[PDB]
Amino acid sequence: MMYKEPFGVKVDFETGIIEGAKKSVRRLSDMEGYFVDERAWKELVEKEDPVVYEVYAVEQEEKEGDLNFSTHVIYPGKVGKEFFFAKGHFHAKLDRAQVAVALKGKGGVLMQTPEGDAKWISSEPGTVIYSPPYWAARAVNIGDEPFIMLVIYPADAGHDYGTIAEKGFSKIVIEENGEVKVVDNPRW
Amino acid sequence: MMYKEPFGVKVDFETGIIEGAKKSVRRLSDMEGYFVDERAWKELVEKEDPVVYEVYAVEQEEKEGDLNFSTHVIYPGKVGKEFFFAKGHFHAKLDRAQVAVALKGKGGVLMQTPEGDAKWISSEPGTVIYSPPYWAARAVNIGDEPFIMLVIYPADAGHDYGTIAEKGFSKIVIEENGEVKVVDNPRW
Numbered sequence: 565m566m567y568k569e570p571f572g573v574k575v576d577f578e579t580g581i582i583e584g585a586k587k588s589v590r591r592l593s594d595m596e597g598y599f600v601d602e603r604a605w606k607e608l609v610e611k612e613d614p615v616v617y618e619v620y621a622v623e624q625e626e627k628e629g630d631l632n633f634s635t636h637v638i639y640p641g642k643v644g645k646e647f648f649f650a651k652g653h654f655h656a657k658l659d660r661a662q663v664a665v666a667l668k669g670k671g672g673v674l675m676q677t678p679e680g681d682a683k684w685i686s687s688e689p690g691t692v693i694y695s696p697p698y699w700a701a702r703a704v705n706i707g708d709e710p711f712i713m714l715v716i717y718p719a720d721a722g723h724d725y726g727t728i729a730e731k732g733f734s735k736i737v738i739e740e741n742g743e744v745k746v747v748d749n750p751r752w
Numbered sequence: 753m754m755y756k757e758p759f760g761v762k763v764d765f766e767t768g769i770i771e772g773a774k775k776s777v778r779r780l781s782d783m784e785g786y787f788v789d790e791r792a793w794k795e796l797v798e799k800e801d802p803v804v805y806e807v808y809a810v811e812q813e814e815k816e817g818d819l820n821f822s823t824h825v826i827y828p829g830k831v832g833k834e835f836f837f838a839k840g841h842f843h844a845k846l847d848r849a850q851v852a853v854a855l856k857g858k859g860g861v862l863m864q865t866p867e868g869d870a871k872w873i874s875s876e877p878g879t880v881i882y883s884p885p886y887w888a889a890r891a892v893n894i895g896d897e898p899f900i901m902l903v904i905y906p907a908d909a910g911h912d913y914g915t916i917a918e919k920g921f922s923k924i925v926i927e928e929n930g931e932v933k934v935v936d937n938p939r940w
Binding site: 572627661679683695697 | 753754755756757758759760761762763764765770810812815816817818819821845846847848849850851853861863865866867871873874875876878879880881882883884885886887902904905906907908909
C-alpha cells in the first residue's frame with residue numbers, strides 16, 4: 565500500500581558530509597545580531613568572515629508522520645568569549661520534537677521554550693539529546709575541532725528563525741580563563 | 753510555552769545499551785514461525801535457545817509530532833542458511849516513517865510494503881536508512897559481530913507485529929557457500 569522508495573545514504577562521521585543532501589553554509593557575516601559582542605563580531609567578519617556552520621539536510625515533502633534528517637557541522641571558534649553555534653529555530657508547528665545524536669567533537673545543545681526557559685545538555689559522541697515539543701535547539705561547539713550532530717526531525721515541523729533572530733537565547737555559552745560557562749544572556 | 757524536560761542519554765556504540773531504557777530481549781524461542789527452516793529452528797532452540805536481538809527503547813506518550821528512539825542490537829547467527837534478524841512490524845498508523853543509523857557491525861535493512869514489495873539496503877556503520885511511510889522494516893545481521901542500529905520513529909506510530917508474524921517478508925536473506933543472497937521467500 566505504498567510507494568516512496570526507501571534509500572540509504574552515507575554520512576561521513578568525520579566531516580558531516582552527506583552526498584546529494586541540501587547543503588547550507590552560514591558564515592559569520594550571515595549571523596549578524598546573534599553574538600553578544602558586536603564589536604568582536606564586526607572585527608572577525610572584516611578579518612576573516614569564517615564559516616560558522618554547515619547543514620546537510622535530507623528532507624521530504626511536508627507531510628504528517630514523515631521524517632527528515634540532517635547533519636549540523638559546527639566549526640570551532642569564538643566571537644569574543646562566545647562559542648560558535650547554530651542559529652537555532654522554533655518549529656513552525658511548535659509541538660514537533662527533534663532528536664540529535666553527537667557524532668564527533670566536543671559540544672552540546674542549548675534549548676529554549678517560547679517563554680525563554682533554557683536548558684543546556686552537553687553531548688560527547690554517543691550521546692543522544694531529546695529536544696521536546698515546543699523547544700528551540702541550538703548546537704554549540706565548545707572545542708577545537710568540528711562538532712557534528714545527526715538531527716532527525718518531523719518532515720512537517722517547519723522552521724521559525726525569526727523569534728530567535730530578534731531575541732536570541734536567554735543563556736549564552738562562553739569561555740573565561742579556561743572555564744566553560746553557561747550564563748545569563750546580558751541582553752535579556 | 754512548554755513543559756517536557758529535555759534530556760540526554762548515552763548510547764554505547766559497542767553494545768547498544770542505553771541505561772534506563774525499556775529493554776526487550778527476544779530469544780530464538782520467541783521467534784517461532786519467523787525463519788524458513790523450522791527443523792533448524794527447533795534444533796537450535798533445543799540446544800541453545802540463543803538471544804537473537806535486544807531493543808533498548810526510549811519512548812514518549814503517543815502524541816502527534818513527538819519522537820521515540822531505540823537501539824536494535826542484532827546478535828550474529830543463522831537459522832539454517834538464514835541470518836538472525838528483528839521481527840519486523842508495520843506501524844499502527846501506517847503512514848509513519850522511520851530513520852535508522854548503523855552504529856556497529858555488518859548488516860542491513862529489509863523493508864516491505866503492505867502488498868509485499870520488498871527492498872534490501874545494506875548499512876555499514878555511518879549509513880542512514882530511510883524507511884518511508886507504509887513500509888515495515890527488519891534489521892538483519894549478516895556478519896559475525898553484533899549489528900547495532902539507532903532507530904528514530906514517531907511517538908504515535910505504534911506497532912503492528914501480527915501481519916509479519918503470519919506472512920513474514922517476501923524475501924529472505926541467506927548465505928550459501930560464502931555468498932550472501934537476498935532471495936524470494938519460498939513460503940510465498
